[PDB]
Symmetry: D2
Subunit: 205 residues, 4 copies
């Protein structure tokens, strides 16, 4: 069912900011595991769905509840990493080039400059006290205003919050290259952020 997104650039294309070693593992092992976990969980839910249709018991309801956590976690892992690769690009393909259009105007109006929004995001990233993510979002419920939000583990942004830029703060995203020095990774990644994709997502809503 759900599959790994097609490889766009080779693993080493984001060097020296993110290593090919990291990208190979992050994609072939970590992302694949969420793919497999999500497929398994949705399958298990379908089986329990049919079981509940036959006997709508509290005991059968309890096993549905047990599987929900795996749908959330692996579903989140699948979606978050898909977003992640799509908002990353080598400098040859426009990575690190500033956003354009309505997103660029919103950034300047709200934060004063790109650098200020980046600074805020880096603060949110360093403030993840465990595994998680930061997302630059467009909030559709308050007039399409920009904000930066943290999530933990593989929690994601849903509903009115549209993800524009996803940044992985899990230790596996940086440890082989940066080790404990996560701030250096958060600083470095903006050199390969695909702001064209972010602008596109701002417009698409």
């Amino acid at each position: 069912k759900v599959t790994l997104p097609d490889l766009k650039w080779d693993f080493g294309a984001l060097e020296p900011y993110i290593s090919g070693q990291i990208n190979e593992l992050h994609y072939t092992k970590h992302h694949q595991t969420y793919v497999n976990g999500f497929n398994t969980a949705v399958d298990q839910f379908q089986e329990l769905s049919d079981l509940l249709a036959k006997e709508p018991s509290p005991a059968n309801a309890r096993k549905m509840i047990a599987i929900q956590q795996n749908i959330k976690f692996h579903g989140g892992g699948f979606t978050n990493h898909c977003l992640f690769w799509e908002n990353l690009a080598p400098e040859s393909q426009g990575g690190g080039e500033p956003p354009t259009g309505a997103l660029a105007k919103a950034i300047d109006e709200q934060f004063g400059s790109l650098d200020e929004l980046i600074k805020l995001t880096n603060t949110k990233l360093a403030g993840v006290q465990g595994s998680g993510w930061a997302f630059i979002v467009k909030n559709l419920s308050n007039g399409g205003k920009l904000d930066v939000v943290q999530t933990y583990n593989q929690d994601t942004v849903t509903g009115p919050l549209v993800p524009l830029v996803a940044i992985d703060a899990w230790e596996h995203a940086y440890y082989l290259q940066y080790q404990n020095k996560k701030a250096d990774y958060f600083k470095a990644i903006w050199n390969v952020v695909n702001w064209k994709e972010a602008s596109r997502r701002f417009d698409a809503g």
Copy 2:
């Protein structure tokens, strides 16, 4: 699909410990709402399941994640209240009579007496800092040992933790009769706890 459990005793059967006013609302309004919410959520998941089979996209995955919370919450609300009514009984039907069999021996071995286990549970109930539950459980993974656990909101005990006695700590469970005096409710409810059902659940596993 999922329906309200058949009424066993009339609403006023647990008086003076829990009022008929409370029981009517708790069953006909609160429990029914979880029933409806659970049916709606499982339906919505089935629709999204079919949508993912057609297009296994990250966008479609995100809406599956959004619905998971409602399955957990309403599923939990459905199951928890089912457990709740089944471990309650009027004194005429054996409510408040101490447990028997293997459960009775386990209680005495682990806690020294029924009163000590009740005291512990009441501490856990008063320690719920918001809406939630306390469960006296049998843990199947550590040799079938008794413990008391808290959950928040409509979170429940799954997997190796077998619920033996569920006690509702949501304010709607007591407010009309006891108001802020939750400790008086926690004290009073043991007069109508169905320990025969608890003993049965200990044995069934």
Copy 3:
């Protein structure tokens, strides 16, 4: 130390929207309990602080961690209810009158109208799946933009999120008058919301 905020209007001043019965209990019992809980927790932390200065052991650190939850919960309970009473007023004192100044302009720019912001807040309130709050906030980090956020239990808005209007979604806030019909309470409360105070808080930041 921390004390209950001085009574401003009498308990029945918000009728028929919130009953005097509710307000008496909410203030004299619920709010007071958070006051007492917060004083106790900060005292206990001071004692443990001195103990750590004498012996900075992992065992002493563990008891500090245990007390943190009570500081958060009771501290939150104290602050949230203080905010709550201060953004409520009888219609005779301007309750239910629309906001003015920069807040009024921000509301119209972002949400189109007051009614739309209220609708959004009511959705967030009904979406609290347990005990909690909704807050209309000013976000100081994204250009002072308005948003509506949920918290659970006695969690609060800190740092860059400035609370403008706090609405209590705990069942004790409505149950005696509305019972299960929380939507009717969420609808009714806006008739006594102090939008002058909200405008003041928007400006003060």
Copy 4:
């Protein structure tokens, strides 16, 4: 105030199960950061404590709430790693040798064998969906019974739950040696678990 626990064995003493590279970083960088974070947070709380004594305002309460998270996280990080090093030992110092005394009897009575308890713990470790820990605990409230519990991030076991064996499941605990293969790390670590210390902690309570 709080300091890094004195080094007992050299960084490479747990090889080939945990690398010296990992241990150097885990101790000198990760543990030190929690030490610094905990000292800073307790200092900040003392300053806010004095500020509240002067003005017990809701605004001052809000900043106390903000700092609580850092006390919990860094306090937990400090305590958890202290526990971690103390339940690890080279094979030359008794690492990997089975527990003795009352703990050994409890393990056999509850789980059937050491291998079964290890299997359960490894399941709990692999089930940490993010950063966290597994703890083999003695529960003082249910008759001193053994259990295995998960925590997330730097959350810890407090009160009646006595930590006997702490196992770090944060990716930084294994990534440089095992990368994504966390199950291999969970399997390998038992060769250097200090079960003598675990037996001692079981007895001390």
